[PDB]
Nucleic acid binder design. Structure first.
Ligand SMILES: [Zn+2]
Lengths: 52, 136, 216, 189
RNA sequence: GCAGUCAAGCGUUCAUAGCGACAUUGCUUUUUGAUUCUUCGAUGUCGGCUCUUCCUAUCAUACCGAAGCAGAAUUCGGUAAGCGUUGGAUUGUUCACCCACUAAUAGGGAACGUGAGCUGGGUUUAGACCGUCGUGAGACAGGUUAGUUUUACCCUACUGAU
């Protein structure tokens, strides 16, 4: 069984995220700066590549 | 290390290090088995690695049947002459060091084994147990 | 061997160009100092932006070439070749020399040390002072959002801090915009090839009627 | 720079009592009693009325004024969990291996355990935080509804099951198995 | 040698999962220089064996993130030097190079660690041979052989002992 609404729920915490380009840290999808002090809150972000 | 061994063997006193020579037991035309290293063989400086009864060694043939000479093959040692302790108390040792050629997966290359075979080796590899005349 | 650009950055020695005393000099890495709409009038592009410097140091020849490439592979892709007049202002005229001592360099087993340290030329340089235009770009006024970005991409190809200043002059001329309005209202200013010719109130009178048919 | 006056207003609902002395906020009401301690903030409360509390600050910077509206929201979450309450609906997602969640009362308290998570043989213990009752939705076979009168001890316990039911050494976009939260509602609604 | 920066282009789609040309800013002192400040009433000059400790620029192991991460497999990145990082053939070798094991066979310091600790194979005295050079004596960061390794009982340090 699938329950395809639940796959939309599971993507909220794993697939609907953003990754920083410098420190590879997982970030909110509505990010604007990284929440770390190692990259330096850089404004060079990227979306998370999904499946297939 | 000993890939293809069935279970576990205990600590048997390391009697034959590298450079040793075992009289080959099987009838596959080899006679000597010059040990070049052992599967296992932890690392400590200037300690040359030693084999015990039942280990899989890597050996080269030094005498007989030139099809098998001059290259590396794995070998299973089936008799050692260093007196090791069985956990039921008795100490025992055979009268020659002896080894049986095999592949990595434990398939012994020969057809039968002359002389006795130690229980600690015959219990570990099944195909040295289905070819052994005497299990000690 | 390409010695780094921090080795020949500052202005330590006095100018040393190619001359009759400097016969053996290799050429620069720049050969074209003007691309874009080179054959454009002064009238079509009324906006000029400057890429000026903030410090006194030397600009390498291949550095200016690589930045000339980077500014020109931006505006030709986001605005096309028609709508910019790029003009590299500074020329590489200095000659940088190098003291080679490689393990087979002109001589025997060991070449020498600091005895006879005069070095053969290897590269060119372009001396730029505090406030000197490097990349003048002429284009239209409403296309100015590209050349702010396009010369921002050229800033990262040579050292120093370099300001991106717009100029109130009518493009590549030396006078302001409201002067050029009155000089386009009145016919005082006559179009040359890619430049323009101004009124000379001083001169022979008949040459000011042989020229300027629209004035009077 | 330093703002000369910054106030917020906490609307106190009906039947709800609030007790504050030296930045300790004790809230009692129709269901439950919450006591949160706020000594780490320079904040002045004042009883301007019996229905609404003014909360203010004086000569605070951008750091300090930002930490004023987080105080009004922390009291507002206290009285909201005291009038209505808080409930968190969580949901089981699994590809093949079924997750089997129970509730066991060991030597200390109501541990929550999960078993057969992705075929695993290790139980995954997670205690309840007190004040939080644990509830299963009987009608839907793959659902769990946490509930309690504080939003903190519910949501920390709701995130506890999300942290403990994670995957290891596999693609998380393929192996999307776990126990996630979907609904953060109130009790009387 | 180690990295940072901007991004034309590679990746059949896709400037950045991974790379990245043209250029540019740095760091390191384990290379090689360049210099001549210290040592010419001498600081025992290669390498190996033995042994301790330190560094992180992480090969392994621990816990994490990332992808053209389905699993396996593999790559990239973070905290991290706690702990391990081998047995051999040839060469005087450092270096190199194969064989084999292994979780792994990471890189470096400490007067290019360490000779009143060793060894003396190498080089760097005198014997001798060959090759080329020289008319000759002789020369050769060219080849090959044979060539004495001294003292601690003092102060400190350390290890134990009153
Ligand atoms: Zn970041």
């Amino acid at each position: 069984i699938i329950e395809p609404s639940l796959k939309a729920l599971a993507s909220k915490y794993n697939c609907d995220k953003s990754v920083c380009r410098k420190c590879y840290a997982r970030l909110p999808p509505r990010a604007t700066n990284c929440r770390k002090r190692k990259c330096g809150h850089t404004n060079q972000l990227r979306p998370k590549k999904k499946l297939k | 290390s000993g890939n293809g061994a069935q279970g576990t063997k205990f600590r048997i006193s390391l009697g034959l290090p590298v450079g040793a020579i075992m009289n080959c037991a099987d009838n596959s035309g080899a006679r000597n088995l010059y040990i070049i290293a052992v599967k296992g063989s932890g690392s400590r400086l200037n300690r040359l690695p030693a084999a015990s009864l039942g280990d899989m060694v890597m050996a080269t043939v030094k005498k007989g049947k030139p099809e098998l000479r001059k290259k590396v093959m794995p070998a299973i040692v089936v008799r050692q002459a260093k007196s090791w302790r069985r956990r039921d108390g008795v100490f025992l040792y055979f009268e020659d060091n002896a080894g049986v050629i095999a592949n990595p997966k434990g398939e012994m290359k020969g057809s039968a084994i002359t002389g006795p075979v130690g229980k600690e080796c015959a219990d570990l590899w099944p195909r040295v147990a289905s070819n052994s005349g005497v299990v000690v | 061997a390409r010695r780094p650009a921090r080795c020949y950055r500052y202005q330590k020695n006095k100018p040393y160009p190619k001359s009759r005393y400097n016969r053996a000099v290799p050429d620069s890495k720049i050969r074209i100092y003007d691309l874009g709409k080179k054959k454009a009038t002064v009238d079509e592009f009324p906006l000029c932006v400057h890429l000026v410097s903030n410090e006194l140091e030397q600009l390498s020849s291949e550095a200016l070439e690589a930045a000339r490439i980077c500014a020109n592979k931006y505006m030709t892709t986001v605005s096309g070749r028609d709508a910019f007049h790029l003009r590299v202002r500074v020329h590489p005229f200095h000659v940088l020399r190098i003291n080679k001592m490689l393990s087979c360099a002109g001589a025997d087993r060991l070449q020498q040390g600091m005895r006879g340290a005069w070095g053969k030329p290897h590269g060119l340089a372009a001396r730029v002072d505090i406030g000197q235009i490097i990349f003048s770009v002429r284009t239209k006024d409403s296309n100015k959002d590209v050349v702010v970005e396009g010369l921002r991409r050229a800033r990262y190809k040579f050292p120093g801090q370099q300001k991106i200043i717009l100029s109130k002059k009518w493009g590549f001329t030396n006078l302001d915009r409201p002067e050029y309005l009155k000089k386009r209202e009145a016919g005082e200013v006559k179009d040359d090839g890619a430049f323009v010719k101004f009124l000379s109130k001083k001169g022979s009178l008949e040459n000011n009627i042989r020229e300027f048919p629209e004035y009077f | 720079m330093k703002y000369i006056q910054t106030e917020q207003q906490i609307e106190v609902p009906e039947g709800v009592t609030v007790s504050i002395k030296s930045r300790i906020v004790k809230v009692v009401g129709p269901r439950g009693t919450l006591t949160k301690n706020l000594k780490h903030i320079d904040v002045t409360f004042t009883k301007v009325n019996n229905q609404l509390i003014k909360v203010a600050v004086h000569n605070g910077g951008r750091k300090h004024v930002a930490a004023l509206r987080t105080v009004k929201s922390l009291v507002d979450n206290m009285i909201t969990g005291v009038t209505k309450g808080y409930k968190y609906k969580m949901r089981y997602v699994y590809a093949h291996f079924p997750i089997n969640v129970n509730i066991v009362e060991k030597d200390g308290a109501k541990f929550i355990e999960v078993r057969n998570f992705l075929g695993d043989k290790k139980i995954r213990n997670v205690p309840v935080r007190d004040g939080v009752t644990i509830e299963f939705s009987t009608n839907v076979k793959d659902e769990i509804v946490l509930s309690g009168n504080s939003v903190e001890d519910v949501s920390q316990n709701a995130a506890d099951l999300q942290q403990i039911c994670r995957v290891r050494n596999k693609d998380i976009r393929k192996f999307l198995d776990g126990i996630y939260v979907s609904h953060k509602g109130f009790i009387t609604e």
